[PDB]
Symmetry: D2
Subunit: 501 residues, 4 copies
């Protein structure tokens, strides 16, 4: 059986050999990057079923992200399998400042009255916590009494009980025992801090990514369609119109504007890390199931992200809760599941990919029984979608090992994928931009082929490439879909059921 749900793996030092040293040994950050040895490691993640690599520009400067992307291009040749290239923007960040006298952190206790300063370019004291806000924005006027300020992935919460106009300081009450360390992520849920739709840092990060060559951008903290439209404009300008934009939904505002965001984007990344701090943590599974249904209904890509195999960062086995989360994300109808720290900076990047692949492959076999998505409810809004519906029906009527589509732009493949047939989908395309562009769509196995000439038998070509890929053997039944004849046919218009000889 082939794996239909796609894997995004984040790259970091965990895979990268430096002068024979594995990550986090004595001296490691001294030695020179070992490019062949690293690439051999990354080629193992590809063979274990990583379909796209995520380059997280929250961490590591341009040269490091340049070097990692080039190491991946090497690994593609060692594996003999191509992968997608996804850039993840930094976006708006609030961090806690340095402390007076280079103190790393302080410990607080429930009931404690302290203050949070809004003045920029100062240091924190134990008593007065200062913020490093992207663009040095003043946030005093943006947050009201009763709002919460949450420090370090939401581990410590401060309730704003009052506002001091003379100092521009929040009077806060500590809500639980915990630590405030320096240069730690701060969230302020249910506030509209006027960060730009697209910051200048993220503009430059994107333009460099587009230069090196990428297939996808995931845009952090998308709040309105404007955040997506402005990234789109740049993709257009530089002739990178092939690039697909996933909005990262991370906060209440993003969730409020989700319908317009989906309309503007090619896909949604469900960024549960932030979203779980920014909205009631118990609501995240509600939003997860709703988002997946709405994006699938739009024929777009949905990625479920963050903590999927979290304990595998430090321990060799996933917990029962983590296997359950990966399985249920498949059953909910996700196109893709993602690894962050587990692949980027953990002790078990390869085992983490193998584990997610094993769960994902198992879960796809339960989609008939338990799948939340319902393709019978969709309006078939074009003739290609009608063909996709009929392909679904054939794969429901009898045992179809494979669907094969000859697809110029990938449109047929995306509509077949949308209907979630009980078969793998071989997308035969004629250019690498379409090929890589398809690597996160559920079920789709993109494969490069010569454009069929008017004398070619498209059906013989489809059967032959399917046998070449080892996907089917003698006696297997396959469905082939194509625009027949080539030149005359305006769209996919023909379906054949073919016994493989």
């Amino acid at each position: 059986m082939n794996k239909r749900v796609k894997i995004v793996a984040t790259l970091g030092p965990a895979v990268e050999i430096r002068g024979g040293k594995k990550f986090g040994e004595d001296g490691y950050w001294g030695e020179k990057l070992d490019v062949e040895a690293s690439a051999k490691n990354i080629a193992k993640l590809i063979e274990a079923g990583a379909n796209t690599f995520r380059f997280n520009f929250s961490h590591g400067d341009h040269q490091e992200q340049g070097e990692r992307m080039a190491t991946v291009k090497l690994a593609e040749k060692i594996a003999g399998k191509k992968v997608g290239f996804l850039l993840d923007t930094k976006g708006p960040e609030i961090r806690t400042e340095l402390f007076e006298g280079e103190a790393k952190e302080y410990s607080y206790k429930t009931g404690e009255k302290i203050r949070v300063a809004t003045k920029q370019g100062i240091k924190s004291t134990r008593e007065v916590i200062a913020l490093n806000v992207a663009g040095a924005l003043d946030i005093y006027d943006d947050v009201e009494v009763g709002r919460q300020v949450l420090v370090d992935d939401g581990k410590l919460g401060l309730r704003v009980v009052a506002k001091d106009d003379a100092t521009r300081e929040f009077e806060v009450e500590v809500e639980n025992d915990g630590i405030i360390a320096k240069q730690k992520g701060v969230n302020i849920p249910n506030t509209k801090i006027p960060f730009p739709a697209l910051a200048e840092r993220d503009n430059d990060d994107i333009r460099f990514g587009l230069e090196q060559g990428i297939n996808f951008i995931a845009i952090s903290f998308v709040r309105t369609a404007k955040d997506v439209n402005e990234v789109r404009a740049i993709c257009e300008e530089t002739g990178n119109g092939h690039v697909q934009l996933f909005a990262k939904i991370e906060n209440q505002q993003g969730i409020d504007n989700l319908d317009e965001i989906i309309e503007a984007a090619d896909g949604i990344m469900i960024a549960r890390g932030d979203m779980g701090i920014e909205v009631p943590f118990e609501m995240v599974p509600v939003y997860q199931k709703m988002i997946i249904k709405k994006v699938n209904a739009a024929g777009k890509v949905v990625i479920t992200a963050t903590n999927m195999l979290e304990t595998m960062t430090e321990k060799p086995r996933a917990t029962r809760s983590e296997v359950s989360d990966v399985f249920n994300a498949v059953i909910d109808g996700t196109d893709a599941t993602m690894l962050s720290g587990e692949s980027a900076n953990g002790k078990y990047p390869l085992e983490s990919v193998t584990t997610m692949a094993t769960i994902d492959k198992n879960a796809q076999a339960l989609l008939n029984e338990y799948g939340r998505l319902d393709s019978d409810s969709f309006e078939r809004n074009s003739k290609t979608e009608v063909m996709a519906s009929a392909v679904k029906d054939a794969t429901s009527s009898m045992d179809i090992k494979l669907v094969v589509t000859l697809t110029k732009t990938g449109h047929t493949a995306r509509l077949i994928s949308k209907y979630r047939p009980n078969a793998d989908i071989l997308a035969l395309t004629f250019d690498e931009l379409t090929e890589r562009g398809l690597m996160l769509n559920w079920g789709v196995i993109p494969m490069l082929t010569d454009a069929p000439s008017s004398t070619d038998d498209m059906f013989e070509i489809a059967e032959r490439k399917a046998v070449e890929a080892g996907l089917v053997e003698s006696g297997d039944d396959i469905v082939i879909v194509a625009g027949v004849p080539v030149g005359e046919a305006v769209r996919t218009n023909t379906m054949r059921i073919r016994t493989v000889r």
Copy 2:
């Protein structure tokens, strides 16, 4: 908008012209049969929607039947449209004898005690009714006390109160007021009277029919699968393997043996006349729905028969219950509705066909909302059946004016029909046996075409035959199914969605 539900019309004097006179006109029986004028009159039934003519061998001799069949063959050429040919057998029958003294009938009152004689060759008296039993069988040992003897379309009931061994007479009580006339039909419900599986006279009737050229045999009072298999043996013996056998379910035994009768036959005629006398009348609607569903699930033809527009025998307008009966037969899922005395012996044969066609045409538009058949429940047991399922799916996703199948034996057109698509089925076939064999399948418009050569584009032929037939025009979307390419393809294996040029 074409009529999907097929009409069977029974031929008789009502459509024959004698010396420029219609049936019922003064002098009619004193004029000679006008063959051409009759053929032109029958041509009007073809144009109005008759798809098959029934030749009832219960009435008239071989000479009369043979000449009716020859006159329909003329009518086909005048209308420019072919129809099926159906022989309906005499089968097991009991009639009241002639009365001593050339008396016509007597009248009887409830509770009156009389006798029914079983001795063959005798005349009836007022107090002693003699039976003409088919093949002069002695029925005395096969009817128990408490059984009922019903005379003339079930109008008069006689309870068997005792058996007189010396006279071989039944002592009977008159259960209701009514008349006994000579040569009227007698039923004895829930007896196993040992009429042969195939009587000699039905053997000879079927041979005569097979010599004339027929597409269908309706076997009267099928009691077991043996009744069907013995007719099949003659069809096989004579090289008439193409002839489809419809079992007429008319009594309790046929209903007990329904599953084995359906397996052995090509279809069922729901013969409601005898059925509603031979089982409790109020159960006939139950048996009708059940049979339609079982036959449809087997991919076979079901004909709903008898009294559907009964009043139009004598009146120009159908009753409200008659329009309701024809409508509800369509919703039940009937392939065909039948006219008996309405077309054969009535004053308004053309109006009867037209009325039936108008009802059938309107009821077909309500099969989506009210239809009792459920194609989603069927096992697709072959590749031609999964193609039929996918055509049904395409006709549910978008407006398809027509499904075109190129079919060698009609097998693809039978399976498309079974799934009751939201479109007309144009069955392009290569011989006239196949063509006329399809004329009672729901939705199917059979049409003769030259066998395509491996040079011929079947999708162009399909489109051109449909434009030439008047069925589609520019802008209409059609589904085309075929075994591509001719030579290699072992079955129907391809579907195209095509906008007609």
Copy 3:
């Protein structure tokens, strides 16, 4: 066991003996009504399953209708069973006049040109048909060129091809061969002849009927809510607020206003006779199913009317199409089936009721498998309604022989009836108006009892009434519903499942 679908039987001269004479005999109408022999005939229809008698004010004067009502009152005492009393208005009928020269009828041929007169109080000639318009209305201005005048149950069509202002005659073309006889019903479909919302003669007939004692009024040709509201005002102002109104839907305007008619009425009579003339005959089965669903969703009574066993007017047995019609009306979800000429004028009134009761009883056993009504879909809009839903659930979960409700006004009985439980409904009420008012609700067996004391065990009273009615025996499981306790309870608020001692 008990017949849940109600029968309305039309009373006419078929059951009425007058000075030893029967309908058709010379001097019949001059002889005095033999009230006792007539009541014994009617008592037989009551025993055979008639639940309500219809008095058709289209035929016979006030005295005739008055004597016929008094004879049913006597028949109730002979049968020992009460029935409802339904008055059916004449309404805006048009009829062909008497001819000159005492002529009964004339023959006409397709293409013949004749005239229809609009002038009132004159006589038809062969060439000039005169119309007897209800209220002597002048229709000349309300029927345009291109309309159709239909004579005699829709049997002869006349196309208005011109209008002569000098004589105020329609110039018509005979559309088909047939007969214009005297006093035959005329319809002019798709016209708004401005007959008043309530004519003086219908006003007078209703008032006469209210004075005699009636439960129901069926209002002929309801076009708007106004037609119902005008009869409502009269029932209310005379102290007859208990009288229930059934709108007869007989024409296109009635169908166009169906939803506000149902709101304003207590029920609908599906008057198929005129409806099948006034709209395309093939649409009637469509409107019947839709009407029955809508009326049942409002908790109101639907009567399926006209031609149900038509041929039993003249012949001893129903056709197979007639049995199918009554069976399919039950499965559609009708509360009540109706007889007109079959019971009012025919040769076989007792046998027609018996036949209809046998069909209804059988058909009820198939409502769980085939029944078109879906109670699971309704909004439960009150707590009496949620209790009726819970009763329906108990009768679905186990074998419940009987549902008993103690109901002051019949509201709880109506709502249980709406949900169509798999059980008979014993409605114990405390006055005869309510008791007779429940006689047409599906499943309801109404029965008189004293208003229970706040002393009384209502669940014991219910069991005892059920044993006294012969409905249950020792071992049977019954559902009892009541407002507990009396005085404190504002509504039905209790359900008990009890095993009969």
Copy 4:
């Protein structure tokens, strides 16, 4: 918003105070158990939503288990709220022995060849790992070449490559890098070590548990119905027939015998820790959903256990994974969710219970929209069950705040619970065994009350207990169910819908 999903919290040192020190603090184990301060910690778990305490007989002697049970009996009096008492057996555990020279652990690399001894009562060396097998059983004959020995929650794999018959030692190959620490769990999947159906240690522990007073026994590693029936015999033999048995399904054999184990047991604990080691980890979510469905269909209790908020052992926040796992367990249909190490040995026992209670409470609001259980499919096999079905129908038809049942044994409450009504269930019972007996049934709020007299209004009692309990206010709608009248009723036979005054 009452929490309908029940919480099982495992007791351990995490909640125990010893001379003013919390668990983990310097010198903790030196100080003595402070019973009052421990009981006050435990009362806070009770207030936050813990419904039953698990006493895990895998860890601590009888003296420690007994003290802990007495402390919870104090906590119930401080909380003002009763809780269930669940004993969890040791069962057939294997552990790594102590090392020679008191060495704590050793590290191994992939491909190392070592030995595992079967000899009982000796210490391990690096090269020869010794096993503490439950009951000192010799496992040498039970594990074949090619089997896997896994150490410490499945973290390190040892493949058996050969067996030395002389020393009765396994030759094993290290399959992955990791640690063998002393006294860690060992698993040998897909073997059948002949552990007795009931080991003497588990017999003794259960008998100690029954003498102290328990409501529930969770039987570890149930392989067959016989493992349950042996504990059942002890419960009955000792007067403890009320005690409920949960089979823990933890290996392949229990899964293979699931249907038989469910028949013999009162419920299932889905013991995902051992299950995910003993069967393919990716299959665990499959078995979970299936178990929940079958157990619910049986009207029994299902507890979903292990790793549910794992990270909250060491960190203040749950991962997105863990929230997703608890939420999906609720949607699957679990009666109860469990905390093990998170409540027994973690830093945040209270915040763990609080967190789970928040997820569980939010998830129940979505069971209507997303719930996998379907009560419509159940056969109602008894009159109580039909009453449960009607209750469910009323809670779906309108807004019912509370279902009240007066239940002597808890049968009516268990069946109402089984049907998952959209309301809390107040179970008023008359003894403490039934009260505590019901604390793991979904939705059930057990409450001790006086047995109603012959004179009492049970519907007044129901309303009044519900108001006193703070569960309903004026104008709320409730559903009350009872066997009325008291002393006459043989079962629940009455449902009332009452507005709180």
